[PDB]
Design a protein around this ligand. Structure first.
Ligand SMILES: N[C@@H](CCC(=O)N[C@@H](CS)C(=O)NCC(=O)O)C(=O)O
Ligand SMILES: N[C@@H](CCC(=O)N[C@@H](CS)C(=O)NCC(=O)O)C(=O)O
Lengths: 205, 204
């Protein structure tokens, strides 16, 4: 009787890797979004005091908590055959995840800052590590033995990459227009390979 | 197969790779790149960033691996250091993520002049650094064994000692008389892995 609740603040922040892995596996869950106003009260109730967190309540009401977003995503993906099928494919899944998180860390430099400072940071990273990391990512994608990030079937790597690329276009929606063909291609391929994720992304949009 | 670890810093991102190979008893060769040789060597490394591992078989065929903790998790998976069940694998990844969030505060201080370094240090040590050390202490208390996850070495334990060495590099006294679970962890891990204790003692 397991119920999976995803507890988070932002609609497209660190929980997206967790929601997209459950969406691609066909696993239902409930979203519980915490407002800035309720964070003082709910904080002491989440183990570790940070979101996102996942609360799993079985049919006897016993609760299991999981925290640390991509540790939760990798556990769910491992359980649903989305962490590669060989130790080599697992290396390659991890390699792309680590490349996408280095890109996400540049994005995070822009968050929760006033307008003026945000724009200053944006101009610095987009002239900086952002394109360098999109080019590394394109070369990773080129090296796959299949049409997705690793082989031809969905992995956690594909889902962390579409989350991170949505963050880059959040900073400049034109940044990737007419460039980085492998990333565009990746996204078309993944939405063709995963009708659930395409429904999720289209519904969400 | 010959394994070469290619890197710049003696206690930077390649430490997770070295310690995993050490704990497993797998030999490798260190190739440290100087600031002066980096222009010429950069175009030869796939991705253009270190650390990188170059594996040459006895036919001299080369396989390259990049992305430090993607290399460490592949080697740890190969040597039964990524947990024995899917639950232990989650707990190994939980602590790694906690440790990397501490490492990211440490990285805010690097390759900065003295005065900016000092100012950044003062902000993180009064900030997310203790918050994260308490989170890690609570993780450590939840282990079903004496190490970070269960009772046998995992990658989690090696990433945590590398990150704790980074904190003490910023303030050698920061953990004196505090955070007992982390002191304890280090004593336990060095007692569980003579290779790593030999490696760390030699290194220091
Ligand atoms: N590495 C952690 C980071 C968790 C984290 O930084 N959470 C922030 C926002 S995403 C938070 O909970 N802030 C509120 C607080 O610390 O009180 C993960 O990926 O889950
Ligand atoms: N997440 C990557 C980070 C690699 C990285 O940032 N390397 C930096 C030094 S820490 C580098 O090689 N800089 C040299 C360059 O970019 O030319 C890893 O962990 O391996």
């Amino acid at each position: 009787g397991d119920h999976i609740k995803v507890i988070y603040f932002n609609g497209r922040g660190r929980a997206e890797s967790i929601r997209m892995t459950l969406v691609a596996a066909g696993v239902n869950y409930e979203d519980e979004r915490i407002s800035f106003q309720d964070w003082p009260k709910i904080k002491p109730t989440i183990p570790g005091g940070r979101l996102p967190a996942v609360k799993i309540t079985d049919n006897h009401g016993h609760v299991k908590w999981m925290v640390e977003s991509l540790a939760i995503a990798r556990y769910m993906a491992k359980k649903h055959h989305m962490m590669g099928g060989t130790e080599e494919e697992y290396y390659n899944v991890e390699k792309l995840i680590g490349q996408a998180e280095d890109l996400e860390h540049e994005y995070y430099k822009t968050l929760m800052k006033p307008e003026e400072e945000k724009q200053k940071i944006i101009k610095e990273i987009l002239n900086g590590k952002v394109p360098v990391l999109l080019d590394i990512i394109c070369e990773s994608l080129k090296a796959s033995t299949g049409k997705l990030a690793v082989g031809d079937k969905v992995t956690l790597a594909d889902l962390v990459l579409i989350a991170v690329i949505d963050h880059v276009t959040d900073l400049d929606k034109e940044f990737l227009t007419g460039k980085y063909p492998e990333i565009h291609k990746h996204r078309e391929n993944l939405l063709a390979s995963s009708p659930r994720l395409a429904k999720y992304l289209s519904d969400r949009a």
